[PDB]
Amino acid sequence: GTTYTIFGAGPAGLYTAWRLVTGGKAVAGDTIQLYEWGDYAFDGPGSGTRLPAGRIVTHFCNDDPKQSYIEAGGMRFIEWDGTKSQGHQLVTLTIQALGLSGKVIDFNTTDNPLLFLREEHIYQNDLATHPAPYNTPGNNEQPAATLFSNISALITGDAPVSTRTQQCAFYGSGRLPSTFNSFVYPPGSIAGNIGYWNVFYDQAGNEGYEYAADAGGYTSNVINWNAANAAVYNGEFAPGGAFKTVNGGYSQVFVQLYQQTLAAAQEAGVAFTLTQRTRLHSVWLEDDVVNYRLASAENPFKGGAVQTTQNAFLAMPPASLDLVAEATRYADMPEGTLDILNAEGVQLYMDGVIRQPSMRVMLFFDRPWWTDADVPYPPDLTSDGAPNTFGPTITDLPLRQVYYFGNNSDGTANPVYGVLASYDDMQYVQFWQELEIDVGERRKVPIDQDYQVLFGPRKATDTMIRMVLLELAKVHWGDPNAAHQIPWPVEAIFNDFSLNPFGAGYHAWAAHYDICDVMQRIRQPTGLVPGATAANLFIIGEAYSNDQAWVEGAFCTAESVLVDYYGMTTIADTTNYPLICAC
Amino acid sequence: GTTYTIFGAGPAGLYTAWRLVTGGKAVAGDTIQLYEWGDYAFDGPGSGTRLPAGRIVTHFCNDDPKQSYIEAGGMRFIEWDGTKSQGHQLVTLTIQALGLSGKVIDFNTTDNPLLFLREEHIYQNDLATHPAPYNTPGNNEQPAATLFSNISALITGDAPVSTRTQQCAFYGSGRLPSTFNSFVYPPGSIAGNIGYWNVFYDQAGNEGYEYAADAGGYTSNVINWNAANAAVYNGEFAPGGAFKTVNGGYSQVFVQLYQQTLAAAQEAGVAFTLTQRTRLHSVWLEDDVVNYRLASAENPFKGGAVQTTQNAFLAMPPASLDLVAEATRYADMPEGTLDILNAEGVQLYMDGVIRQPSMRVMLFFDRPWWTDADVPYPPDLTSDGAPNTFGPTITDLPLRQVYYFGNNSDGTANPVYGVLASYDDMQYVQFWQELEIDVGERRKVPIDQDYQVLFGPRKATDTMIRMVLLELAKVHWGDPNAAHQIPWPVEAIFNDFSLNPFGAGYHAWAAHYDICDVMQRIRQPTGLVPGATAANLFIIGEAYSNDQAWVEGAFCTAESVLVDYYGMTTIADTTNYPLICAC
Ligand SMILES: Cc1cc2nc3c(=O)[nH]c(=O)nc-3n(C[C@H](O)[C@H](O)[C@H](O)COP(=O)(O)OP(=O)(O)OC[C@H]3O[C@@H](n4cnc5c(N)ncnc54)[C@H](O)[C@@H]3O)c2cc1C
Ligand SMILES: Cc1cc2nc3c(=O)[nH]c(=O)nc-3n(C[C@H](O)[C@H](O)[C@H](O)COP(=O)(O)OP(=O)(O)OC[C@H]3O[C@@H](n4cnc5c(N)ncnc54)[C@H](O)[C@@H]3O)c2cc1C
């Protein structure tokens, strides 16, 4: 029979294995082999070093599955609304199909976030009366969302940008309107050749940009990504929907994809295996035949024997592809082979995204100190009918955003109250990295070989805890000395997504790319090599999706490959929902 | 005879060859082989694509050696004062020995820089009148240098940090004083295990940090580097002396090193060859024998036949070492070899510096428009006794500093007037990189393969020119609509030092490292590998020096290797001038 070989048991690799079995492509006598560098707990407590999978990681306080948790990776989704044709269609279908719809609950955010900006405390509702301390006339008396909407409208002009298909079309054909007013960018400029931050800066000045970057919601991006995509994803008509989470953590989706793939496989007669602590080391082609070597987690740089498959999925992000491509880039390859990942067009299209570093600090407290009556500036989390919101609080500090999960347990365990502290952006990666080593210690692991998130959230250093509490004191009291008022966390851990093999929290389409052409053609990179024999070697994952920073994008690129290159019947209604953009 | 093999004809590699011949270490019958990936113009017009060498590049307008020029890489040095024992000793001795001392001119800076901060225009002398628009009480009425000095004093306490030797000792043993007042850092903490930004932010708050980062200009350095080295380099006691430049360009130092080494080698009977467009591909050891492969610049990832030498200098920065290390990291190495750059201890010590990305835009004007009588906020460049100062103007924009070189031409009838625009820091690299491609064009070269600085300054795009003129209009007119008043540049070019093979403008010692032990021991990396046979394979350059961001550091590490490992008599007086820190 046929062997399907999947490198990476993140969302995209797990989803691919699940669809091949349940969708009926794999048949009795077929083999699905899944290889994962890490060691995720797919088989209950003690079966791994952290819950699956890749950048999704639910972290239970005390590694106690009955406790409060904080999502130490991705945390929420947008429920599919088929009547609106909007939301995360494949995540919603997959949650339903796995029997987890019963566990879906509201992820409520405050309508009135606290803003801590240039040593001022302003609840967002109060901006008309307490203007933000930014020299941006007009804009500083409105939520940052108003300025995002205004800049998007200066870019999109009269172009239709309400539907996912209209949005996809803008990426490739969107032009600055004939009325664009700039010294820098002429009217009718191709918006996909413009940096979002560059044009935001041009149109609103440094103070408008800084206000938007500091006071914008967690949806709002502001990095110098593709201005065509950023305008349609930051504008009034941005893709929206009700935020949900999966009670008990997003990670159970990945446990269930694995368990339910294994049970469907047994019924179907399909051999489905997961081989962990085992990475793809090197990959190349001999015509249609994929050649590859594996390496152990213990010795990740030294390849085993050369293996072959006819069907290989690289279910891994750019920084993970880079480490594989490095293993053949400098090598004398066998006669008649194609070093596919290092081909000029492949390397060029892999640069069609820019990377955003992220670090998350997860702190559990024995009480919800942020609700105390004497807290000068508490987060406004209280809702009349349904429960307390999760925040955020939004700041111009290195600690960019705070969410307050509090007790999200079934209520059975000893109540701990969780806080998620967000550090993001190239500006701050060097700031947070030195907090990762004890103040009494020297660095011991080369930075590029510290696979921290792959292993699991790492114990926060005393320096890192004290820095978070100092920041939370300035946010909630406006007095750095109030850090002494905050009770010491009962557990504190972190995830630094800038470290290999992830190399990014998020990917964002780059300026100077035809996004649809990359989304379409990078998936089967032999199509980027003039004269090459087609091979079933695929790149999948959120990075080169139309839903970056969502599991939805990992599912959509994987679905699009099964449809386009395996002729599978999609589980989606794609009538109004292209899995990826068509050109 | 004895063969010396030098990889990298930047300042360190050139200096090394020069000292080996003129110091009489290389004798009749010996060979010195120099390899350079680039194609620098060592032999006048038509002999390369840019003037030598590495990150020093003098750029003449219109490629006219009689026209005005801007330094498109390193631009100034501190003259050695042997009376006080302060300044760049080896650079000053080298310029004298090469017969270039007659070209040394003051590089004067204004004592009244224009500050453009949060849309306010403040000449620094007027901060008592018009406090900086930062919520940092008291600090905002005084130059940022005062805040830098006060933070340095909070870190150093009573410790002597006056001399180069005492500063070196502070790197390894310096502790926060008993009086240190912090929630985050205990009194007596090892300063070398603290990030400078981390502790500046702890002591001065985000608004004090932002003011220092935005208004410090000159050589101030707020990145999150080793706080022990940052405190002694940013404080009262910081290394000083008189700033100079080389009239006609710093590049002539490197032209003269090459030409005078060649003439001295011919007189001495030493075979001295420079082989350009030819890079080190891979390196490793067999006992004491250095094994290597070369690659052509045309095909930089493919090695040729294995070559051996007994004496090898890697005269290249971290990002360059990384590319060579990638070529063996994943390889199945010959029996009996040591893959020296990938050894754990070597990799760990290579991470003993952090990287600061830098982009320089060089613009030539047909007139000094910034001196026009109708300019609202002209720079205060005059000096009653002598030629104008060079600025800078200092801002909180992506364009963080402006230098005004004006007419430094030597004999053209039609002089141009030069302006240097500085973009720096991890915050802004993704902002400036999208300006490097025409707004009508897609990216065509993968970003990690675009060796722009190696080839020479690149023509500024129309978008990049317009972006700079917009920023200059905000700065000097306080109105972005005034950009139309600035004459379009005669020529505009850029150098993006973030690109390979440089991967940094600047290196800075990292927190959580014993700087002296790295500085000493990385030079001969076999000493970081337990059980390794000692080999004459050396790492030299500014990056692991005690003078990072100066040519002086390139010369000092090279000189330290010649003294410590080849028994040469130093040209320096080291009485008050350790070449590198001693532990
Ligand atoms: C801070 C943060 C917050 C997020 N929040 C949300 C959110 O709220 N909702 C949401 O839906 N999404 C969220 N996301 C995004 C979500 O995490 C990603 O979209 C998703 O994890 C992408 O899945 P993937 O399979 O493409 O990649 P990954 O999750 O990156 O998985 C790739 C896998 O490949 C493995 N791998 C790498 N190299 C090799 C190799 N050589 N051999 C074998 N295996 C290898 C990795 O170890 C990993 O398991 C968030 C992400 C971050 C970082
Ligand atoms: C924006 C800027 C401003 C600066 N200002 C000043 C200043 O005012 N004054 C000052 O004194 N210094 C200044 N410097 C610093 C100065 O440029 C450096 O200290 C100096 O260039 C370091 O010399 P080096 O030989 O260590 O390395 P580099 O100058 O980086 O030279 C390394 C050489 O190695 C070559 N190479 C790399 N890989 C290979 C390979 N595999 N095989 C062969 N060759 C290879 C490179 O092409 C290059 O020629 C500045 C730097 C920058 C970026």
Side-chain angles (χ1 to χ4, degrees), chain A residues 183 193 201 224 293 302 330-332 351 430 434 441-443 447 466 471 474 512, chain B residues 183 193 201 224 293 302 326 331-332 351 430 434 441-443 447 466 471 474 512:
Chain A
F183 184 75
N193 289 343
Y201 180 82
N224 202 35
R293 305 166 70 181
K302 303 309 199 190
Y330 306 91
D332 296 322
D351 293 343
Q430 291 181 340
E434 301 304 345
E441 301 289 328
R442 307 300 196 184
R443 193 158 294 280
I447 298 224
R466 293 171 171 280
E471 295 191 282
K474 291 182 307 167
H512 300 285
Chain B
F183 183 75
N193 287 345
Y201 173 83
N224 202 33
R293 304 169 72 183
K302 302 316 196 185
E326 286 167 16
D332 294 319
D351 290 348
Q430 297 182 336
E434 303 307 344
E441 297 197 46
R442 307 301 194 191
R443 181 181 245 91
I447 179 160
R466 296 171 167 284
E471 297 193 282
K474 296 192 311 202
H512 302 281

Short mmCIF file of all heavy atoms in Angstrom, two decimals, chain A residues 183 193 201 224 293 302 330-332 351 430 434 441-443 447 466 471 474 512, chain B residues 183 193 201 224 293 302 326 331-332 351 430 434 441-443 447 466 471 474 512:
data_model
loop_
_atom_site.label_atom_id
_atom_site.label_comp_id
_atom_site.label_asym_id
_atom_site.label_seq_id
_atom_site.Cartn_x
_atom_site.Cartn_y
_atom_site.Cartn_z
N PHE A 183 3.64 62.32 0.44
CA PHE A 183 4.94 62.63 -0.18
C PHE A 183 5.68 61.35 -0.58
O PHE A 183 6.63 61.42 -1.41
CB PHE A 183 5.78 63.47 0.77
CG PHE A 183 7.07 63.91 0.16
CD1 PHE A 183 7.05 64.92 -0.78
CD2 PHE A 183 8.29 63.32 0.50
CE1 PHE A 183 8.21 65.34 -1.41
CE2 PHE A 183 9.45 63.72 -0.15
CZ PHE A 183 9.42 64.72 -1.11
N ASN A 193 3.04 45.91 -2.10
CA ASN A 193 4.47 46.29 -2.18
C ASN A 193 4.83 47.32 -1.13
O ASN A 193 5.95 47.90 -1.19
CB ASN A 193 4.82 46.75 -3.59
CG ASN A 193 4.81 45.60 -4.59
OD1 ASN A 193 4.87 44.43 -4.22
ND2 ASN A 193 4.72 45.94 -5.88
N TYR A 201 2.86 55.07 9.51
CA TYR A 201 3.82 56.15 9.88
C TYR A 201 3.67 57.37 8.96
O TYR A 201 3.63 58.52 9.41
CB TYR A 201 5.22 55.56 9.85
CG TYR A 201 6.30 56.54 10.20
CD1 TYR A 201 6.59 56.82 11.52
CD2 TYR A 201 7.17 57.04 9.25
CE1 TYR A 201 7.59 57.71 11.85
CE2 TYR A 201 8.18 57.92 9.57
CZ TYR A 201 8.42 58.24 10.89
OH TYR A 201 9.42 59.10 11.22
N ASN A 224 5.61 45.76 10.42
CA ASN A 224 5.78 46.23 9.02
C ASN A 224 5.49 45.14 7.99
O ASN A 224 6.31 44.91 7.09
CB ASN A 224 7.15 46.86 8.77
CG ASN A 224 7.14 47.79 7.58
OD1 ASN A 224 6.13 48.47 7.35
ND2 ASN A 224 8.27 47.91 6.90
N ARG A 293 16.68 11.95 5.92
CA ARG A 293 17.36 11.36 7.10
C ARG A 293 16.66 11.90 8.35
O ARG A 293 16.14 13.04 8.33
CB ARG A 293 18.85 11.62 7.10
CG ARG A 293 19.64 11.20 5.87
CD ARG A 293 21.02 11.79 5.83
NE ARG A 293 21.86 11.19 6.85
CZ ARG A 293 23.12 11.51 7.07
NH1 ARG A 293 23.65 12.56 6.49
NH2 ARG A 293 23.84 10.83 7.97
N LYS A 302 22.92 14.98 13.64
CA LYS A 302 23.58 13.85 12.92
C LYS A 302 22.50 12.88 12.41
O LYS A 302 21.64 12.43 13.17
CB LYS A 302 24.74 13.28 13.73
CG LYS A 302 25.80 14.33 14.10
CD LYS A 302 26.42 15.25 12.96
CE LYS A 302 27.75 15.87 13.41
NZ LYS A 302 28.31 16.93 12.51
N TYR A 330 25.02 23.21 2.18
CA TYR A 330 26.47 23.31 2.01
C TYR A 330 27.03 21.96 1.59
O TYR A 330 28.29 21.86 1.50
CB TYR A 330 27.11 23.84 3.29
CG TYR A 330 26.56 25.14 3.82
CD1 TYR A 330 25.51 25.16 4.74
CD2 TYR A 330 27.14 26.37 3.45
CE1 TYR A 330 24.98 26.37 5.18
CE2 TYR A 330 26.63 27.57 3.92
CZ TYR A 330 25.62 27.56 4.85
OH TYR A 330 25.12 28.76 5.32
N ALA A 331 26.16 20.97 1.35
CA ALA A 331 26.58 19.57 1.13
C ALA A 331 26.80 19.29 -0.36
O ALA A 331 26.21 19.96 -1.18
CB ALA A 331 25.61 18.60 1.71
N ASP A 332 27.71 18.36 -0.65
CA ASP A 332 27.86 17.79 -2.01
C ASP A 332 26.78 16.71 -2.15
O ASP A 332 26.87 15.66 -1.52
CB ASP A 332 29.32 17.40 -2.23
CG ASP A 332 30.23 18.62 -2.19
OD1 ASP A 332 29.82 19.68 -2.70
OD2 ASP A 332 31.31 18.51 -1.64
N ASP A 351 10.71 33.38 2.25
CA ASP A 351 10.84 34.76 2.79
C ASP A 351 9.58 35.62 2.55
O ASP A 351 9.60 36.79 2.89
CB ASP A 351 12.10 35.45 2.23
CG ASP A 351 13.39 34.85 2.69
OD1 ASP A 351 13.34 34.13 3.67
OD2 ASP A 351 14.45 35.22 2.13
N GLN A 430 15.40 41.11 23.03
CA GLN A 430 16.66 41.15 23.81
C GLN A 430 16.37 41.54 25.26
O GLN A 430 17.13 41.19 26.15
CB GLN A 430 17.68 42.10 23.17
CG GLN A 430 18.18 41.54 21.82
CD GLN A 430 19.20 42.41 21.15
OE1 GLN A 430 19.32 43.60 21.42
NE2 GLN A 430 19.88 41.86 20.14
N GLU A 434 17.24 38.06 28.73
CA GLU A 434 18.25 38.00 29.80
C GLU A 434 17.53 37.73 31.13
O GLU A 434 18.18 37.33 32.08
CB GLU A 434 19.07 39.27 29.88
CG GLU A 434 19.80 39.57 28.57
CD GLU A 434 20.71 38.45 28.08
OE1 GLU A 434 21.02 37.52 28.85
OE2 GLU A 434 21.14 38.52 26.87
N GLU A 441 23.78 33.19 37.78
CA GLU A 441 24.33 32.20 36.84
C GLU A 441 24.78 32.84 35.54
O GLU A 441 24.15 33.84 35.05
CB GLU A 441 23.29 31.14 36.46
CG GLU A 441 22.73 30.36 37.66
CD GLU A 441 23.72 29.41 38.28
OE1 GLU A 441 24.59 28.84 37.55
OE2 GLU A 441 23.64 29.28 39.54
N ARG A 442 25.68 32.15 34.89
CA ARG A 442 26.08 32.43 33.50
C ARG A 442 25.18 31.63 32.57
O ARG A 442 24.65 30.62 32.99
CB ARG A 442 27.52 32.03 33.27
CG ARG A 442 28.50 32.62 34.27
CD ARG A 442 28.54 34.13 34.31
NE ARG A 442 29.72 34.58 35.00
CZ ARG A 442 29.97 35.86 35.25
NH1 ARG A 442 29.05 36.80 35.01
NH2 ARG A 442 31.12 36.19 35.82
N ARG A 443 25.14 32.04 31.29
CA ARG A 443 24.43 31.26 30.27
C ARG A 443 25.18 29.94 30.07
O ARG A 443 26.41 29.94 30.11
CB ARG A 443 24.37 32.00 28.92
CG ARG A 443 23.38 31.38 27.95
CD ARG A 443 22.92 32.38 26.86
NE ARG A 443 22.14 33.52 27.32
CZ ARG A 443 20.83 33.55 27.62
NH1 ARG A 443 20.07 32.46 27.58
NH2 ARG A 443 20.26 34.69 28.00
N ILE A 447 22.13 29.92 22.54
CA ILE A 447 20.74 30.41 22.42
C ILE A 447 20.03 29.63 21.32
O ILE A 447 18.87 29.30 21.51
CB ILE A 447 20.68 31.94 22.24
CG1 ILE A 447 21.27 32.66 23.45
CG2 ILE A 447 19.24 32.36 21.98
CD1 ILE A 447 20.46 33.86 23.93
N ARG A 466 10.06 38.96 39.52
CA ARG A 466 10.10 40.30 40.13
C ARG A 466 9.86 41.37 39.06
O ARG A 466 9.13 42.31 39.33
CB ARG A 466 11.39 40.51 40.93
CG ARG A 466 11.54 39.65 42.17
CD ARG A 466 12.90 39.74 42.81
NE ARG A 466 12.81 39.05 44.09
CZ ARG A 466 12.29 39.58 45.19
NH1 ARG A 466 11.84 40.83 45.19
NH2 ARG A 466 12.22 38.83 46.28
N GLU A 471 6.18 45.41 36.93
CA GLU A 471 5.35 45.95 35.86
C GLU A 471 3.87 45.97 36.29
O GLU A 471 3.19 46.96 35.97
CB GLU A 471 5.68 45.21 34.55
CG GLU A 471 7.10 45.46 34.12
CD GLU A 471 7.45 44.99 32.72
OE1 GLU A 471 7.66 43.77 32.56
OE2 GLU A 471 7.44 45.85 31.82
N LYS A 474 3.09 48.85 38.57
CA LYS A 474 2.97 50.16 37.89
C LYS A 474 1.61 50.20 37.21
O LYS A 474 0.94 51.25 37.26
CB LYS A 474 4.08 50.34 36.85
CG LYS A 474 5.44 50.49 37.50
CD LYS A 474 6.62 50.71 36.53
CE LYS A 474 6.70 49.68 35.45
NZ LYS A 474 7.62 50.08 34.36
N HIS A 512 6.08 43.31 -0.76
CA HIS A 512 6.85 42.97 -1.98
C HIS A 512 6.67 41.50 -2.32
O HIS A 512 7.56 40.91 -2.97
CB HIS A 512 8.32 43.40 -1.79
CG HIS A 512 8.54 44.86 -1.54
ND1 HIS A 512 8.46 45.81 -2.55
CD2 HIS A 512 8.87 45.52 -0.40
CE1 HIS A 512 8.72 47.00 -2.04
NE2 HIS A 512 9.01 46.85 -0.69
N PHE B 183 13.21 46.47 43.63
CA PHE B 183 12.35 45.28 43.86
C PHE B 183 12.95 44.08 43.11
O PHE B 183 12.68 42.91 43.44
CB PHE B 183 10.93 45.56 43.38
CG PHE B 183 10.01 44.41 43.65
CD1 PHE B 183 9.55 44.15 44.94
CD2 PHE B 183 9.62 43.57 42.64
CE1 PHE B 183 8.78 43.04 45.20
CE2 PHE B 183 8.81 42.47 42.88
CZ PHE B 183 8.37 42.22 44.17
N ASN B 193 25.72 39.76 35.19
CA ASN B 193 24.58 38.84 34.98
C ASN B 193 23.25 39.62 34.85
O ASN B 193 22.20 38.94 34.85
CB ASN B 193 24.49 37.83 36.13
CG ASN B 193 25.58 36.77 36.06
OD1 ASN B 193 26.25 36.61 35.03
ND2 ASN B 193 25.84 36.11 37.18
N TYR B 201 15.63 50.25 33.11
CA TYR B 201 14.16 50.30 33.18
C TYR B 201 13.72 50.14 34.63
O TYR B 201 12.78 50.85 35.08
CB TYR B 201 13.63 49.14 32.30
CG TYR B 201 12.15 48.90 32.35
CD1 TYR B 201 11.28 49.65 31.58
CD2 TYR B 201 11.61 47.82 33.03
CE1 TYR B 201 9.92 49.40 31.54
CE2 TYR B 201 10.25 47.55 33.02
CZ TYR B 201 9.38 48.40 32.34
OH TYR B 201 8.03 48.22 32.31
N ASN B 224 20.05 45.86 25.54
CA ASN B 224 20.06 45.05 26.77
C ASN B 224 21.37 44.24 26.85
O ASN B 224 21.29 43.02 27.02
CB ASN B 224 18.86 44.12 26.88
CG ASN B 224 18.62 43.72 28.32
OD1 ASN B 224 18.89 44.55 29.22
ND2 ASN B 224 18.08 42.53 28.49
N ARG B 293 37.77 24.19 3.26
CA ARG B 293 37.30 24.28 1.86
C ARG B 293 37.02 25.76 1.57
O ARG B 293 36.62 26.47 2.51
CB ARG B 293 36.13 23.35 1.56
CG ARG B 293 36.37 21.88 1.87
CD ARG B 293 35.12 21.09 1.81
NE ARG B 293 34.66 20.93 0.44
CZ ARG B 293 33.52 20.31 0.14
NH1 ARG B 293 32.68 19.97 1.10
NH2 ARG B 293 33.17 20.15 -1.13
N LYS B 302 29.04 25.88 -2.08
CA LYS B 302 29.70 24.65 -2.60
C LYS B 302 31.22 24.74 -2.45
O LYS B 302 31.89 25.62 -3.08
CB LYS B 302 29.15 24.36 -3.99
CG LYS B 302 27.63 24.18 -3.97
CD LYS B 302 26.99 23.31 -2.82
CE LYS B 302 25.55 22.88 -3.11
NZ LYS B 302 24.89 22.15 -1.99
N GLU B 326 27.68 26.47 9.89
CA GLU B 326 26.53 25.72 9.31
C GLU B 326 27.05 24.66 8.34
O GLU B 326 26.30 23.63 8.18
CB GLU B 326 25.58 26.69 8.62
CG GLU B 326 24.79 27.50 9.62
CD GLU B 326 24.05 28.71 9.07
OE1 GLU B 326 23.88 28.79 7.81
OE2 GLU B 326 23.66 29.56 9.92
N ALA B 331 26.99 17.72 9.08
CA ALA B 331 27.79 16.86 8.17
C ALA B 331 28.30 15.64 8.94
O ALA B 331 28.44 15.69 10.19
CB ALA B 331 28.90 17.60 7.53
N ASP B 332 28.47 14.54 8.21
CA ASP B 332 29.15 13.35 8.78
C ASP B 332 30.64 13.55 8.56
O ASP B 332 31.12 13.43 7.42
CB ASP B 332 28.56 12.06 8.22
CG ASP B 332 27.13 11.84 8.65
OD1 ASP B 332 26.79 12.12 9.83
OD2 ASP B 332 26.39 11.45 7.79
N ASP B 351 28.11 33.05 21.59
CA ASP B 351 26.88 33.76 22.02
C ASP B 351 27.18 34.74 23.16
O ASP B 351 26.21 35.35 23.68
CB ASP B 351 25.80 32.77 22.42
CG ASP B 351 25.19 31.98 21.31
OD1 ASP B 351 25.43 32.35 20.12
OD2 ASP B 351 24.52 30.97 21.61
N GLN B 430 12.77 45.71 10.61
CA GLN B 430 11.69 45.36 9.66
C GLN B 430 11.05 46.61 9.06
O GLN B 430 10.57 46.54 7.89
CB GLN B 430 10.61 44.50 10.33
CG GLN B 430 11.16 43.17 10.80
CD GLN B 430 10.08 42.30 11.42
OE1 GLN B 430 9.06 42.78 11.90
NE2 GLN B 430 10.37 41.03 11.58
N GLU B 434 11.78 47.04 4.17
CA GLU B 434 10.81 47.12 3.05
C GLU B 434 11.05 48.36 2.16
O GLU B 434 10.55 48.37 1.01
CB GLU B 434 9.38 47.02 3.59
CG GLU B 434 9.14 45.73 4.41
CD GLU B 434 9.51 44.41 3.72
OE1 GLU B 434 9.68 44.39 2.49
OE2 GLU B 434 9.57 43.40 4.39
N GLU B 441 7.93 46.79 -7.34
CA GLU B 441 8.61 45.48 -7.53
C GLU B 441 8.36 44.56 -6.36
O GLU B 441 8.15 44.98 -5.22
CB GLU B 441 10.11 45.68 -7.70
CG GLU B 441 10.40 46.50 -8.95
CD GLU B 441 11.82 46.42 -9.46
OE1 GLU B 441 12.35 45.30 -9.54
OE2 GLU B 441 12.38 47.50 -9.83
N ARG B 442 8.42 43.28 -6.68
CA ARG B 442 8.46 42.19 -5.70
C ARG B 442 9.90 41.96 -5.28
O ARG B 442 10.85 42.29 -6.04
CB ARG B 442 7.90 40.91 -6.30
CG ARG B 442 6.53 41.04 -6.93
CD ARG B 442 5.47 41.52 -5.97
NE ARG B 442 4.14 41.29 -6.56
CZ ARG B 442 3.01 41.78 -6.07
NH1 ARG B 442 3.00 42.55 -5.01
NH2 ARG B 442 1.86 41.46 -6.62
N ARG B 443 10.10 41.39 -4.10
CA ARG B 443 11.44 40.92 -3.69
C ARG B 443 11.90 39.83 -4.64
O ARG B 443 11.08 38.97 -5.01
CB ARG B 443 11.39 40.41 -2.26
CG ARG B 443 12.74 39.93 -1.78
CD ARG B 443 12.45 39.46 -0.37
NE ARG B 443 13.19 40.36 0.42
CZ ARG B 443 12.78 41.49 0.92
NH1 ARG B 443 11.52 41.85 0.79
NH2 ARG B 443 13.65 42.23 1.59
N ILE B 447 16.39 37.06 1.63
CA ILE B 447 16.93 38.18 2.44
C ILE B 447 18.29 37.72 3.01
O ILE B 447 19.23 38.51 3.00
CB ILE B 447 15.91 38.61 3.52
CG1 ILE B 447 16.48 39.75 4.37
CG2 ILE B 447 15.48 37.46 4.38
CD1 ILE B 447 15.35 40.49 5.07
N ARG B 466 12.21 59.42 -0.40
CA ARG B 466 11.03 60.22 0.04
C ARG B 466 10.81 60.04 1.55
O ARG B 466 10.48 61.04 2.19
CB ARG B 466 9.80 59.90 -0.79
CG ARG B 466 9.98 60.31 -2.25
CD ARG B 466 8.84 59.81 -3.14
NE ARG B 466 8.91 60.48 -4.44
CZ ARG B 466 8.53 61.73 -4.67
NH1 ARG B 466 7.95 62.48 -3.74
NH2 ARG B 466 8.70 62.23 -5.88
N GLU B 471 11.10 62.71 6.88
CA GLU B 471 11.63 62.76 8.26
C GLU B 471 12.44 64.03 8.42
O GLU B 471 12.24 64.71 9.45
CB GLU B 471 12.37 61.44 8.58
CG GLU B 471 11.43 60.26 8.52
CD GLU B 471 11.94 58.95 9.11
OE1 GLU B 471 12.74 58.27 8.41
OE2 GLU B 471 11.55 58.64 10.24
N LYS B 474 9.98 66.96 8.78
CA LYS B 474 9.45 67.01 10.16
C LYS B 474 10.50 67.60 11.11
O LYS B 474 10.15 68.43 11.94
CB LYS B 474 9.08 65.60 10.61
CG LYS B 474 7.97 64.97 9.80
CD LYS B 474 7.40 63.71 10.42
CE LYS B 474 8.40 62.67 10.85
NZ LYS B 474 7.75 61.32 10.93
N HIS B 512 25.17 37.67 31.56
CA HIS B 512 25.32 36.25 31.93
C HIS B 512 26.55 35.64 31.23
O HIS B 512 26.62 34.42 31.04
CB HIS B 512 24.04 35.46 31.63
CG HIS B 512 22.81 35.95 32.31
ND1 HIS B 512 22.53 35.66 33.63
CD2 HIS B 512 21.76 36.66 31.86
CE1 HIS B 512 21.38 36.19 33.94
NE2 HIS B 512 20.86 36.81 32.89
#
